[PDB]
Amino acid sequence: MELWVSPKELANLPGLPKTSAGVIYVAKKQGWQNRTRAGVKGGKAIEYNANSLPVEAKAALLLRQGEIETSLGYFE
């Protein structure tokens, strides 16, 4: 299953600090498989594979995933 996450979205999980500045800085302490995509905003956008995040951030991630955006607007 594909489920990448952005630093700004990690700035809210408990295990991870509340500011992307701490996540990206801590990202070097490990280097979770981050896929870059210089085609969204304009400056190499960093991402994080949810499968690469530990369990404390994963479980917390799926938590704030309740209703993301459109697509499943039909509440499934």
Coordinates of C-alpha atoms in Angstrom, one line a residue:
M1 CA 0.0 0.0 0.0
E2 CA 1.4 3.4 -0.9
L3 CA 1.2 6.1 1.8
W4 CA 3.9 8.8 1.8
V5 CA 3.8 11.7 4.2
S6 CA 5.2 15.3 4.2
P7 CA 7.3 16.9 7.0
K8 CA 4.6 19.5 7.7
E9 CA 2.2 16.5 8.4
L10 CA 4.7 14.8 10.7
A11 CA 5.0 18.0 12.8
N12 CA 2.0 16.8 14.8
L13 CA 2.8 13.1 15.8
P14 CA 3.8 12.6 19.4
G15 CA 7.0 10.5 18.8
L16 CA 8.0 13.2 16.3
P17 CA 8.5 16.9 17.4
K18 CA 5.7 19.4 16.7
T19 CA 7.8 21.3 14.1
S20 CA 9.0 19.9 10.8
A21 CA 12.3 21.6 11.7
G22 CA 12.8 18.9 14.3
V23 CA 11.5 16.1 12.0
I24 CA 13.8 16.9 9.1
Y25 CA 16.7 17.4 11.5
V26 CA 15.9 14.1 13.1
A27 CA 15.3 12.6 9.6
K28 CA 19.1 12.6 9.3
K29 CA 19.4 10.6 12.5
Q30 CA 17.9 7.8 10.3
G31 CA 17.0 8.9 6.8
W32 CA 13.6 7.2 6.2
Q33 CA 13.2 6.4 2.5
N34 CA 12.1 9.9 1.4
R35 CA 11.0 10.2 -2.2
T36 CA 11.7 13.6 -3.8
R37 CA 9.4 15.2 -6.3
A38 CA 10.5 18.5 -7.8
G39 CA 7.2 18.9 -9.7
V40 CA 4.7 19.9 -7.0
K41 CA 5.7 23.4 -5.5
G42 CA 9.1 24.1 -7.0
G43 CA 12.3 23.2 -5.1
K44 CA 12.6 19.4 -4.6
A45 CA 9.8 18.4 -2.2
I46 CA 10.8 15.9 0.4
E47 CA 8.4 13.1 1.5
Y48 CA 8.5 10.2 4.0
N49 CA 7.3 6.6 3.4
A50 CA 4.8 5.7 6.2
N51 CA 6.2 2.1 6.1
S52 CA 9.6 3.6 6.9
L53 CA 8.3 5.6 9.9
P54 CA 8.6 3.8 13.3
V55 CA 5.5 2.4 15.0
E56 CA 4.8 5.4 17.3
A57 CA 4.6 7.7 14.3
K58 CA 2.8 5.1 12.1
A59 CA 0.0 4.3 14.5
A60 CA -0.3 8.1 15.2
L61 CA -0.3 8.7 11.4
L62 CA -3.2 6.3 10.5
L63 CA -4.9 8.2 13.4
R64 CA -4.8 11.7 11.8
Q65 CA -5.6 10.0 8.4
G66 CA -9.3 9.8 9.3
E67 CA -10.9 11.5 6.3
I68 CA -8.0 13.0 4.3
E69 CA -9.4 14.9 1.4
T70 CA -11.8 14.1 -1.5
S71 CA -11.6 10.7 -3.4
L72 CA -13.5 8.8 -0.7
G73 CA -15.9 11.7 -0.1
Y74 CA -18.6 9.0 -0.3
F75 CA -17.4 7.9 3.2
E76 CA -16.8 4.5 1.4

